[PDB]
């Protein structure tokens, strides 16, 4: 009737991307489980997958705020270039502050939609470093 | 086999929100059509709905960049508060620069998902003025 970390992890495990080992599930058992996806073909990029009532959040880390030469100019450029990355947008997090790439989809989206979002966010993260490299230090 | 402005406008027209007059379709005929949704219950807030290959874009205007007291501080706050608005994120556009609220969903999403995104984005726009008012001039 709606996704939870456990049910979503099971569904994802049965897809080709995971059955083939190109990605793997890391479900953290606890009070309420936390789902992580490791994109093996993106250098083991970990992706956080969390249902949250009004949306399913899919998030990955970009680079620390310290790696940005001009945070002021980069912030404005981020808001001007939403078009650059389909289905996901860049954010700022706290622990040192880090730039993230998050996607959001309906709490009742299909498995294919959730899968597509994860795959797209991973590709977007690599694309961010490729299209924003000029703003980085080294 | 995938949404276009015309087919999406037809589907939306048959939903309760539009059959009741609480929202209405404004499809601009031309070379390739452009779809707009007027949220009558949000002060006739116009919403742009456009399919674009890798995503369906849903966008509305927030306020001109001139209405923001400290664009530098507001930009950083926007990136820190993604959680504030589910399913949509804030951006910057050009004609004078204006702050926008855009949502993105799969090119094959269900009508209910597209409808939910539009409704949520409208509510988010009102919420943005309510939660960010301190950053505005008057």
Residue numbers in the entry:
A (entry chain A), B (entry chain A): 37 to 131, 135 to 177
The authors write:
Nevertheless, the functional dimer conventionally described for the T3SS chaperone family does not correspond to this « asymmetric unit dimer » but is reconstituted by symmetry related molecules, issuing with two dimers each one being formed by crystallographic second order axis. The Tb-Xo4 molecule is localized at the interface of the two monomers present in the asymmetric unit, participating in the stabilization of the crystal packing, trapped by the N-terminus and Trp-39 of monomer A, by Glu-112 of monomer B interacting with the atom of terbium, and by Arg-136 of a symmetry-related monomer B. The 3D structures of the two monomers are very similar, with a two-layers alpha + beta mixed domain, and adopt the α-β-β-β-α-β-β-α topology characteristic of the T3SS chaperone family, with an average root-mean-square deviation (RMSD) of 0.6 Å on Cα for the 115 closest residues over the 139 amino-acids that have been crystallized. Two residues present alternative positions, Glu-90 in monomer A (A-Glu-90) and His-155 in monomer B (B-His-155), these residues being localized at the biological dimer interface, in close proximity. One molecule of glycerol has been trapped in monomer A in the concave surface of the twisted six-stranded anti-parallel β-sheet in a pocket formed by the side chains of 4 residues (Tyr-72, Phe-84, Glu-95, Leu97). The location where is found this glycerol in molecule A corresponds to the region of interaction between the chaperone and the effector in the structure solved of the complex formed between the multi-cargo chaperone CesT and Tir from E. coli, Tir being the first translocated effector in the infected host cell via the T3SS.
The role of BacA in rhamnolipid secretion, biofilm formation and virulence, was confirmed by phenotypic experiments with a bacA mutant. At a molecular level, quantitative proteomic studies revealed an accumulation of the BAC cognate partners by the bacA sessile mutant, suggesting a negative control of BacA toward the bac operon. Finally, a first crystallographic structure of BacA was obtained revealing a structure homologous to chaperones or/and regulatory proteins.
